Amino acid sequence: CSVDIQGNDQMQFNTNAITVDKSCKQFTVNLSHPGNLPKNVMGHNWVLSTAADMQGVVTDGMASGLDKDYLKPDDSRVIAHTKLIGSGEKDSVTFDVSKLKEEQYMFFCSPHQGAGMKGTLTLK
Numbered sequence: 486c487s488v489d490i491q492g493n494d495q496m497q498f499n500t501n502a503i504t505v506d507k508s509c510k511q512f513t514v515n516l517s518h519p520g521n522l523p524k525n526v527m528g529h530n531w532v533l534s535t536a537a538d539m540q541g542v543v544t545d546g547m548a549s550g551l552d553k554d555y556l557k558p559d560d561s562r563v564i565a566h567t568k569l570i571g572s573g574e575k576d577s578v579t580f581d582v583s584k585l586k587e588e589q590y591m592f593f594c595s596p597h598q599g600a601g602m603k604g605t606l607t608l609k
């Protein structure tokens with residue numbers, strides 16, 4: 486009921502598809518950042534929304550800027566998210582699987598989603 490994910494200096498995650506087992510009550514994402522760049526140059530987060538909400542979350546998040554971890558404050562469309570991390574840092578988020586429907590979900594790094602830093606998540 487957990488997955489470890491890396492975001493690197495090339496704006497790539499090392500998975501682009503997450504499967505959450507139907508039997509999980511909670512699911513945890515452990516994000517880390519190989520590389521040698523600080524959070525204010527190449528920072529990554531991990532953000533989950535419906536496929537339909539992704540573009541708006543990214544647009545509004547990018548506009549909110551670095552000091553808001555590139556997320557619109559209190560954004561109702563964000564199902565779960567980590568903080569923004571730089572190289573050698575790590576952050577984990579846990580969420581209730583009850584928040585998912587057996588729907589199209591996307592995960593992404595908000596500042597680098599437009600550069601392709603995204604993938605799918607499905608409750609299976």
Ligand SMILES: [Cu+]
Binds near residue numbers: 496528
């Ligand atoms: Cu990123």
